Design a protein around this ligand. Sequence first.
Ligand SMILES: CC(C)(O)CNC1CCOCC1
Length: 460
Amino acid sequence: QPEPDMITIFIGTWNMGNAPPPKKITSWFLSKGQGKTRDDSADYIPHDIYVIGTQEDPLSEKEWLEILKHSLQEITSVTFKTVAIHTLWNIRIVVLAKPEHENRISHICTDNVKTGIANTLGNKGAVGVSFMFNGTSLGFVNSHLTSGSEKKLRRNQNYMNILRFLALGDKKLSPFNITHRFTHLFWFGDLNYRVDLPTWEAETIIQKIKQQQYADLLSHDQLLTERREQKVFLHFEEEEITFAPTYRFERLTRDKYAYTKQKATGMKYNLPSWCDRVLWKSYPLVHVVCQSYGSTSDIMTSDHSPVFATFEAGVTSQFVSKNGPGTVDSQGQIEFLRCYATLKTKSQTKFYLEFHSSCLESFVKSQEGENEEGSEGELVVKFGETLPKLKPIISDPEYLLDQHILISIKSSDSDESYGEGCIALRLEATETQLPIYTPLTHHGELTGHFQGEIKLQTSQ
Ligand SMILES: CC(C)(O)CNC1CCOCC1
């Protein structure tokens, strides 16, 4: 039985509106409805992993697991295994996997983050799951962010609290938040970003939706505009949206958007919006392809429609050589030339680098760089030719070229990371000086850049 080099992953997000689901929800898991939908010829093919995020979920974990498992069994004739389930209030994530994957999955973590303070603490936040699939780390986040058209800044704040405080993946990666801990990170949920148009334009918006003319609406979508302006979800991807707004519907039909202000809405309008979203961030030069992104048309118990997304995701095998793991492989090395960090900090401390990677027996600290001033005011930390030679555990190029090096630039004074980034070893050549680059972020905000050259020696 060969190990896979690619799996498919289903992501669902559904705000259930505190109502039980209808008797049949199979269209969701089949990626059928509006948008980028899955070919009928694939309907009996199971995805490898199904990750289901709900919000406003009224069901017990047991109730929902029985619906999900019976749904997938009806579709695929496979009895899925439960990898993990975690619930914060009415926000839930379920991870299900094909039985053949049970021994490939390990290091399962779950966590939650509650957002807001006093007033604004009590129902919004995120749940998440991580695990290893053979040699590949996978992370999944289901968030229900602050509601209301005039709270986009709060949503952005909720996002930063979630990525700072959600404790998933390898704790040894102490400088790194969830946006650096995983080969593939999927973040989805009722993110609650709205189409920012005047209230008076409500019937015009509905007209456009009925004509399937989304362009003038997506240009006002707050998540797209906040992402363009680098306010949120920096360095994540989202597939093009080609499905109607998923909120806010009258229940039991999809023929009507309920947008007008009511006591029950706090006297707020709910203009039709793409509240329900799936984004991802994968390490550089790893295969990840979105093969569906859309909404169902036939599940109408909630004021939201479910959203699906599916992905091809590259994965690697759990490599054993005669040498590593449990020692170094002397035929392997990673070298760095002409390297420097450019930082936005207004502070003057010395800095050093830390290199983290599962291809190393443990993380490596550099010497301090030499600080200089850039021509436009910047701090430039020069490492030149001074960075250490990294000694990987395995030298085989079929392993090493699939690996990544995480970099943190840390203050000598405080040992606090000022920026984090990631370099792929998927090079065009070995034993050859090649340019490398990563942006540097901290708390998911851009803080600088790291650039230079790499020289990678493998056993070939
Ligand atoms: C690295 C690449 C293949 O050129 C683009 N892939 C992106 C996928 C999602 O996260 C950021 C990287």
